[PDB]
Amino acid sequence: MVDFAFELRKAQDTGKIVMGARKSIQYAKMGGAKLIIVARNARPDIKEDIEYYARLSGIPVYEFEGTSVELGTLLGRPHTVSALAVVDPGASRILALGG
Numbered sequence: 001m002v003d004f005a006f007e008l009r010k011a012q013d014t015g016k017i018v019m020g021a022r023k024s025i026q027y028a029k030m031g032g033a034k035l036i037i038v039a040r041n042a043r044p045d046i047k048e049d050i051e052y053y054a055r056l057s058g059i060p061v062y063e064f065e066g067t068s069v070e071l072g073t074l075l076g077r078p079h080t081v082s083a084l085a086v087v088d089p090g091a092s093r094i095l096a097l098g099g
Contacts, residue, residue, distance in 0.1 A: 004064065005074055007036070007094040012075060015090025019075060021046045024083040028053035033085035035098050036061045039068040042082040050083060060098025 018027055021042070027033040028050055036046055036054050040063055054061045064071050066083055068080035075081055089095050 002093050002096045004094075004097065007092045007097075008074060009076075010092035011086050011089050013090070015086065015088035015092060015094075017084050017086050019077070019081050019084045021050075021083045024085045025049055025053060027085040027087065028057065028059055031057040031059070031088050033059055034089060035059065035095055036065055036083060037071075037084040037086070037097075038083045039066065039071045041067050046083065061097075062097045072078075075092040084093050091095070 018024065018033070024036055025046070028036055036050050036059060038050055038061065051061055068082040070080040072079050075084070086094055
C-alpha cells in the first residue's frame with residue numbers, strides 16, 4: 001500500500017514540493033504541479049479554489065485525513081500547512097494517491 005506519510009516525506013527529500021495555500025494555488029493555476037494535497041481543515045474557499053484550478057489543468061487533488069497541524073509536523077515544520085503541491089515526486093510513489 002502507498003503510505004502517505006512516508007511517500008510525502010520521500011517526495012519532499014528526493015523531488016520538489018511547494019508548501020502553503022498561496023504557492024499551491026499558484027502552481028495549480030499555472031499547471032505546474034502533479035498533485036495538490038490539502039489538509040482536511042483547509043479553509044473552505046481555499047479548498048474550493050485549489051479543486052477548481054486543479055480541475056482546469058487535470059491535476060489530481062488529495063485530501064489528507066489530518067489537520068494542518070499534523071500536515072505541518074509531517075513536513076518537518078513547527079507551523080500549520082493547509083496545502084502543498086508536489087512539483088516533482090522524486091523517487092516517491094506519492095502520485096499514486098491521485099488515482
